[PDB]
């Protein structure tokens, strides 16, 4: 598995479902299959949905992921009273799947602004492009685009812009980083 990092807004905008949850139990299941005899196993986590910021009216009860990290499988701390913010993909009623490359962090690690941004601010900015800068100097191509500089300035994916900023469209058509409101 190979991931490129994701700013929370990107995650939030790309994901079908965004929830606060705890994983209670873990177990393997076979959902497939494969065109020769040989079957594909997935870990099924049983979860409790504490809260939904984005996604379907029917609560998520199960999260799937791969058994190995080679296919982007992720471990959640099960039993262990561990709450997470999980951004991922809907997979029919009450089910979603996640990968190693998804935005998935313990609830208690989020800044106050990140948490508040889940109400509205991230959604407002989905029309804006967020572009990670690989190295200084880097330049926007289009006006509706923010440069994500955390790695370049901080060597930290959960840096300053991740923690406090959203990339919002600015009356006129330019997008810009904002530290926000609410």
């Amino acid at each position: 598995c190979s991931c490129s990092p994701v700013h929370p807004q990107q995650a939030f905008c790309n994901a079908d479902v965004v929830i606060r949850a705890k994983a209670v139990s873990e177990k393997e299941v076979d959902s497939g299959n494969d065109i020769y005899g040989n079957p594909i196993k997935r870990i099924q986590y049983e979860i409790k949905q504490i809260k939904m910021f984005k996604g379907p009216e029917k609560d998520i009860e199960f999260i799937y992921t791969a058994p190995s990290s080679a296919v982007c499988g992720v471990s959640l701390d099960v039993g262990g009273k561990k709450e997470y913010l999980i951004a991922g993909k809907a997979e029919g009623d009450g089910k979603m799947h996640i990968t190693l490359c998804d935005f998935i962090v313990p609830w208690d690690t989020l800044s106050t602004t990140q948490k508040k941004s889940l109400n509205h601010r991230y959604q407002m900015g989905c029309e804006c492009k967020i572009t990670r800068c690989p190295m200084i100097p880097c330049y926007i191509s289009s006006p509706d685009e923010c440069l994500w500089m955390d790695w370049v300035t901080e060597k930290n994916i959960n840096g300053h812009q991740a923690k406090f900023f959203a990339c919002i469209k600015r009356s006129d058509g330019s997008c810009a980083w904002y530290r926000g409101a609410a």
Partner: protein, 159 residues
């Protein structure tokens, strides 16, 4: 299997991304293999038809394996440990823009990492290791190097 039970393995490039001429895809994968050929008694040979051990392909979103790709960014590719059928195979997400240089997602760097999985390696927590899932060795191509952590892993399997 945590490892292949043979020395001579086959691969085939099943399909081809629009982002690059076929010859450029061919070359990037050949180099990525080389990376692992230089430090093990493994040799790979190319098949142009039928089922090779390591079936390499490009796909977007759902592509038949229960592990859907996820659009631009996020997961760039994934692969399966040694085994029959789907095992050992490599899938690249064609919602990435695959390039020869570092302008887009570099195919060679990603293919090298994923081949590691195809051979039995897991992820490394070392951020200078190729097997670290997050760009592994960020830029330097004309002087990219396996880390010793990567070499230890692969030589622990194949000598």
């Amino acid at each position: 299997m945590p490892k292949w039970r043979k020395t001579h393995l086959t691969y085939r490039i099943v399909n081809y991304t629009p982002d690059l001429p076929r010859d450029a895809v061919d070359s990037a994968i050949e180099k990525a293999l080389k990376v692992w050929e230089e430090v093990t008694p493994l040799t790979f040979s190319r098949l142009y038809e039928g089922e090779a051990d390591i079936m390499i392909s490009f796909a977007v979103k759902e592509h038949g394996d229960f592990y859907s790709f996820d659009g631009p960014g996020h997961s760039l590719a994934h692969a399966y440990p040694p085994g029959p059928g789907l095992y050992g195979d490599i899938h690249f997400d064609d919602d990435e823009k695959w390039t020869e240089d570092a302008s887009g997602t570099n195919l060679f760097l990603v293919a090298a990492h994923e081949l590691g999985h195809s051979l039995g390696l897991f992820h490394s927590a070392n951020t200078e290791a190729l097997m670290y899932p997050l760009y592994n060795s960020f830029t330097e191509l004309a002087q990219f190097r396996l880390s010793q952590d990567d070499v230890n892993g692969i030589q622990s399997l194949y000598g």
